Amino acid sequence: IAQARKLVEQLKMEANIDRIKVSKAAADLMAYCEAHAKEDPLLTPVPASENPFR
Amino acid sequence: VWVVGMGIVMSLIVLAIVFGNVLVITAIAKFLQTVTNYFITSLACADLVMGLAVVPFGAAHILTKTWTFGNFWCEFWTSIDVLCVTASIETLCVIAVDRYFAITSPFKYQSLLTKNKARVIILMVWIVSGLTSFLPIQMHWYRATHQEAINCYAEETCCDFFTNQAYAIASSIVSFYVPLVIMVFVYSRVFQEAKRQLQKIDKSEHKALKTLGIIMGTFTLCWLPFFIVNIVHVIQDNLIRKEVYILLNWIGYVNSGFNPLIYCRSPDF
Amino acid sequence: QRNEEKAQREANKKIEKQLQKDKQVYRATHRLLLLGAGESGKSTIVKQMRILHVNATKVQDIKNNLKEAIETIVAAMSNVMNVPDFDFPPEFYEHAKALWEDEGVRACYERSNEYQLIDCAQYFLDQDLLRCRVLTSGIFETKFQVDKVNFHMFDVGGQRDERRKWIQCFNDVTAIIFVVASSSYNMVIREDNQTNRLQEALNLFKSIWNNRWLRTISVILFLNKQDLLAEKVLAGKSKIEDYFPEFARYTTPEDATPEPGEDPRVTRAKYFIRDEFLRISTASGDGRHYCYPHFTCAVDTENIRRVFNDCRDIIQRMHLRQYELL
Amino acid sequence: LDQLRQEAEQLKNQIRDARKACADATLSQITNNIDPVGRIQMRTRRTLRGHLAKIYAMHWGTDSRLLVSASQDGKLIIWDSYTTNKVHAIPLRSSWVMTCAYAPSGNYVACGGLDNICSIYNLKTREGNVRVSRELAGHTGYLSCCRFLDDNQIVTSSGDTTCALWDIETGQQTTTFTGHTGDVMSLSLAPDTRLFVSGACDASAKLWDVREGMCRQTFTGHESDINAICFFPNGNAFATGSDDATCRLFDLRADQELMTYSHDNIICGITSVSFSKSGRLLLAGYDDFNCNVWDALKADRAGVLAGHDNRVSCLGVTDDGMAVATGSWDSFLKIWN
Numbered sequence: 001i002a003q004a005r006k007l008v009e010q011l012k013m014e015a016n017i018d019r020i021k022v023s024k025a026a027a028d029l030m031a032y033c034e035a036h037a038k039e040d041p042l043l044t045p046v047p048a049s050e051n052p053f054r
Numbered sequence: 055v056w057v058v059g060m061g062i063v064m065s066l067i068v069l070a071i072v073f074g075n076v077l078v079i080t081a082i083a084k085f086l087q088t089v090t091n092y093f094i095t096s097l098a099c100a101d102l103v104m105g106l107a108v109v110p111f112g113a114a115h116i117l118t119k120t121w122t123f124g125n126f127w128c129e130f131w132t133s134i135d136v137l138c139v140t141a142s143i144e145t146l147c148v149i150a151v152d153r154y155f156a157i158t159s160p161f162k163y164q165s166l167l168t169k170n171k172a173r174v175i176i177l178m179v180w181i182v183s184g185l186t187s188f189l190p191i192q193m194h195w196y197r198a199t200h201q202e203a204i205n206c207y208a209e210e211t212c213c214d215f216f217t218n219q220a221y222a223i224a225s226s227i228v229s230f231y232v233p234l235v236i237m238v239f240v241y242s243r244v245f246q247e248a249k250r251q252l253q254k255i256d257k258s259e260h261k262a263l264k265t266l267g268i269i270m271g272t273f274t275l276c277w278l279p280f281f282i283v284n285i286v287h288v289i290q291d292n293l294i295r296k297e298v299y300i301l302l303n304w305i306g307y308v309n310s311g312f313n314p315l316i317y318c319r320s321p322d323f
Numbered sequence: 324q325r326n327e328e329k330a331q332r333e334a335n336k337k338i339e340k341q342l343q344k345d346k347q348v349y350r351a352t353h354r355l356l357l358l359g360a361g362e363s364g365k366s367t368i369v370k371q372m373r374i375l376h377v378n379a380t381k382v383q384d385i386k387n388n389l390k391e392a393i394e395t396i397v398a399a400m401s402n403v404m405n406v407p408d409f410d411f412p413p414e415f416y417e418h419a420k421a422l423w424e425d426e427g428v429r430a431c432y433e434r435s436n437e438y439q440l441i442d443c444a445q446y447f448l449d450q451d452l453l454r455c456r457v458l459t460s461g462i463f464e465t466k467f468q469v470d471k472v473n474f475h476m477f478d479v480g481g482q483r484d485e486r487r488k489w490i491q492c493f494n495d496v497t498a499i500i501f502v503v504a505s506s507s508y509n510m511v512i513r514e515d516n517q518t519n520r521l522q523e524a525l526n527l528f529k530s531i532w533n534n535r536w537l538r539t540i541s542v543i544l545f546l547n548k549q550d551l552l553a554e555k556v557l558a559g560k561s562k563i564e565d566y567f568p569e570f571a572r573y574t575t576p577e578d579a580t581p582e583p584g585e586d587p588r589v590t591r592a593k594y595f596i597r598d599e600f601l602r603i604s605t606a607s608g609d610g611r612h613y614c615y616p617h618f619t620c621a622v623d624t625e626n627i628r629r630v631f632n633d634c635r636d637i638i639q640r641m642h643l644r645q646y647e648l649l
Numbered sequence: 650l651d652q653l654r655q656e657a658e659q660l661k662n663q664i665r666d667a668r669k670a671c672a673d674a675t676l677s678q679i680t681n682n683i684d685p686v687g688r689i690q691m692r693t694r695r696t697l698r699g700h701l702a703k704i705y706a707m708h709w710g711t712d713s714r715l716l717v718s719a720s721q722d723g724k725l726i727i728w729d730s731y732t733t734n735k736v737h738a739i740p741l742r743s744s745w746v747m748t749c750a751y752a753p754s755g756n757y758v759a760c761g762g763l764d765n766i767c768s769i770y771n772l773k774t775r776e777g778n779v780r781v782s783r784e785l786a787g788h789t790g791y792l793s794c795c796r797f798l799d800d801n802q803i804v805t806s807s808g809d810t811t812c813a814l815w816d817i818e819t820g821q822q823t824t825t826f827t828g829h830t831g832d833v834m835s836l837s838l839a840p841d842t843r844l845f846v847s848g849a850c851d852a853s854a855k856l857w858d859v860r861e862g863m864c865r866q867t868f869t870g871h872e873s874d875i876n877a878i879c880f881f882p883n884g885n886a887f888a889t890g891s892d893d894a895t896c897r898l899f900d901l902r903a904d905q906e907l908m909t910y911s912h913d914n915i916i917c918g919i920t921s922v923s924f925s926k927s928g929r930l931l932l933a934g935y936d937d938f939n940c941n942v943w944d945a946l947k948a949d950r951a952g953v954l955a956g957h958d959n960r961v962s963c964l965g966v967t968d969d970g971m972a973v974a975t976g977s978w979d980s981f982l983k984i985w986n
């Protein structure tokens with residue numbers, strides 16, 4: 001019967017955490033993608049001269 | 055006026071053989087490659103070669119009523135069509151033979167036949183087929199001894215078939231008698247095995263007859279009329295005309311045109 | 324370096340040469356997977372294939388099962404046992420032996436259906452090496468040859484799984500061997516309040532038969548434990564009618580092939596259980612599915628030809644399915 | 650006794666109230682001004698043959714040149730992608746293999762399967778004789794994934810709703826994680842190897858801690874089993890591929906589900922997911938005999954890779970983001986670019 005006692009102890013731990021708005025996380029992800037989009041060989045094809053597989 | 059119109063029939067039939075056969079050859083190689091597909095590929099290649107290198111020449115000779123090339127070309131044409139007809143039939147015997155262990159010896163089928171054995175048997179049967187046609191044709195050892203073929207052999211414009219008795223009998227035997235009885239025995243046993251397997255299944259708790267009957271009947275009906283006269287007209291004293299000879303030869307040629315349609319019906323095809 | 328690639332190219336040749344030899348061996352083997360419920364007898368069948376045909380903890384293991392069997396019946400007879408690693412002393416073996424003669428214990432053995440008890444309780448207290456239950460978690464395998472042919476028999480086993488998510492791995496086996504207990508129609512399995520053991524095995528068979536991945540695998544059915552079935556029917560303890568009401572209206576099939584000497588009552592009960600398993604397979608069996616029922620006894624029927632003959636028919640029918648014959 | 654369950658309902662409802670308050674605006678409304686990537690087409694550059702049976706496992710190397718594959722024929726073949734030459738072929742003691750790995754330093758390879766035992770092999774040894782180094786055998790049930798933190802630490806996830814952090818030197822579990830109610834199917838370490846996640850069969854995922862060995866969060870947005878999972882290159886997001894047609898992207902800081910990737914004409918499952926170098930494309934395998942390419946910020950399909958003849962069971966992207974390898978059940982790897 002102690003399983004219920006342990007389960008309610010774990011759920012209270014996740015209750016007290018810090019959260020931020022969805023807008024901030026979305027902006028961070030979009031900024032990271034925009035910053036790193038330059039060096040993405042699968043996204044923007046590289047010239048065949050510098051292609052190890054061709 | 056039907057003479058000119060009949061030329062379209064030959065062109066329509068001939069074009070189908072070349073177009074129809076290359077459809078299955080390209081698909082098998084570019085996609086299907088198993089132990090039992092090499093024989094089908096060899097048969098398809100033989101049919102394609104026969105059609106392309108035989109049918110137009112015969113059609114042109116029939117329509118123009120005058121052979122245009124020399125004696126060497128006519129000898130080459132006879133050699134090639136005999137070789138192709140001999141090799142096309144003998145592959146069906148191999149197909150029947152190897153389909154037999156699968157049904158009759160499921161366990162030893164994998165060990166009995168492999169790629170090397172299949173290649174060796176294909177090469178052997180091709181050599182056996184080739185030895186029948188080119189060697190007697192080039193050696194001029196089949197020439198007749200009567201006074202009717204002298205004009206044909208002395209005129210470069212003319213062309214016909216007046217082969218001696220012995221070579222005709224031997225070729226007809228070694229090209230039709232051996233495969234037919236073997237394939238009949240093979241397909242008889244397969245039917246019995248299915249029946250027991252059907253009887254056993256029924257005890258525990260006619261598609262095969264239809265398919266075996268169709269397979270047998272199509273080529274036997276197409277080929278037996280041509281190979282039944284090759285003994286008779288030589289044995290008899292001019293009891294068989296030449297127009298019926300040509301017509302039955304063309305009927306026999308037709309068989310391999312739709313033989314690949316009868317075969318090669320697997321879902322993966 | 325030009326010489327750098329030459330060694331690497333030669334390295335591929337050595338590796339690629341070994342794979343050619345292994346392909347022939349792999350393609351010339353048959354894999355059979357065992358399945359069933361608990362206490363069915365999957366492990367016992369494997370032992371028959373090892374000691375017979377192709378191919379010192381027994382003293383302690385046999386005593387381990389014997390000790391637990393007597394305690395369970397004696398503990399519930401009224402209606403130290405769990406001390407860790409207690410060895411069998413000379414007095415310990417003598418002390419446990421005397422409890423069998425008690426008449427009060429005998430009455431508890433007569434009502435063994437009500438509670439849970441191991442089958443081998445009577446044999447060990449009063450083929451011997453294989454009449455013992457020892458459980459193993461890791462997949463149990465076995466390699467043997469019958470006639471110049473390689474057979475690979477394995478049992479995934481494990482503790483009960485209600486999800487069986489690993490079943491998609493066995494999508495290429497030759498056949499599935501199914502073992503059921505046909506003398507356990509009045510016992511409750513591992514819960515003490517549930518459907519009887521036979522119904523629990525029937526539900527498992529229905530799920531296995533109607534499976535997404537196993538749409539082209541035949542099943543061999545081993546209606547095991549035929550020895551106890553004749554004993555239960557002979558006695559008047561329990562009747563099939565009480566647990567299975569459909570037995571009242573059942574009749575003996577016309578196509579009946581009993582043994583040399585067998586009572587009509589025993590033969591009817593044998594075929595009722597077999598026929599009930601067959602209606603499930605035929606309901607959704609439309610080609611490429613077959614069931615082969617046998618009346619096998621795991622311990623006292625030594626013949627591997629039953630698996631050998633059925634496997635040949637499976638492949639023979641599989642070839643007949645190709646080329647559009649049957 | 651009974652009052653504890655009643656109190657648990659209040660705590661459960663507390664979580665939903667906080668999450669619903671943080672939903673300022675959906676991601677789709679934010680990124681309506683982003684120009685679409687367009688149509689992405691890739692052509693096969695290499696094909697690797699030599700496996701006798703279907704394939705479940707695959708992993709690249711740090712040099713992004715050599716990869717290792719596993720199959721149920723009992724072989725563990727190491728390839729050289731540039732020149733297509735097998736370098737090794739290790740026979741296995743068991744014929745049932747469900748996972749493989751590759752050490753960051755390239756000196757070790759891991760394996761495991763239905764035998765409930767993880768094995769570690771040695772590659773760079775004296776006299777060139779590969780042999781089993783250790784045999785980690787403490788579990789109950791089949792293994793699903795293995796990962797390498799360094800040459801000494803390995804993380805496994807068996808089918809008994811548990812995980813562990815092994816220790817090759819001593820062959821004993823340093824710590825164990827519990828809390829799932831269903832079989833664990835996959836895991837993926839963080840870029841800094843300080844956190845990792847796991848997708849169980851109870852339609853939930855958790856964010857464990859390597860050091861403390863305790864659970865931190867729990868996301869329960871799915872409706873069926875979970876078969877794949879992978880971290881964002883940033884390290885603050887991960888995408889999940891479930892048994893239904895949908896794949897969802899979660900956020901660690903916002904503690905909610907951001908977007909859902911689904912199509913009307915797809916009714917199959919997903920067996921493997923992976924991102925790109927910059928986290929702009931989300932490749933995902935399928936039972937539809939092909940691999941689809943999604944868009945991280947638009948949920949728009951942007952190409953199909955359908956060069957296979959059987960189901961796709963593994964997928965991976967090189968460290969430099971130059972090629973994509975997709976194995977299948979017909980024993981044929983393929984390198985796309």
Ligand SMILES: Nc1nc2c(ncn2[C@@H]2O[C@H](COP(=O)(O)OP(=O)(O)OP(=O)(O)O)[C@@H](O)[C@H]2O)c(=O)[nH]1
Nearest residue numbers: 361362363364365366367442443456548620621622
């Ligand atoms: N009387 C009788 N007992 C049998 C027979 N076959 C097996 N048993 C019993 O089987 C027991 C051995 O354990 P099993 O029931 O085989 O257990 P198991 O096969 O490991 O169990 P599972 O893995 O769940 O199938 C012994 O107690 C035997 O009495 C049989 O034909 N007759």
Ligand SMILES: CN[C@@H]1CCc2c(ccc(O)c2O)[C@H]1O
Nearest residue numbers: 135136139140215222225226229
């Ligand atoms: C002119 N056409 C020939 C004539 C005789 C002949 C053919 C085929 C096979 C043979 O064994 C033959 O004897 C025909 O193709």
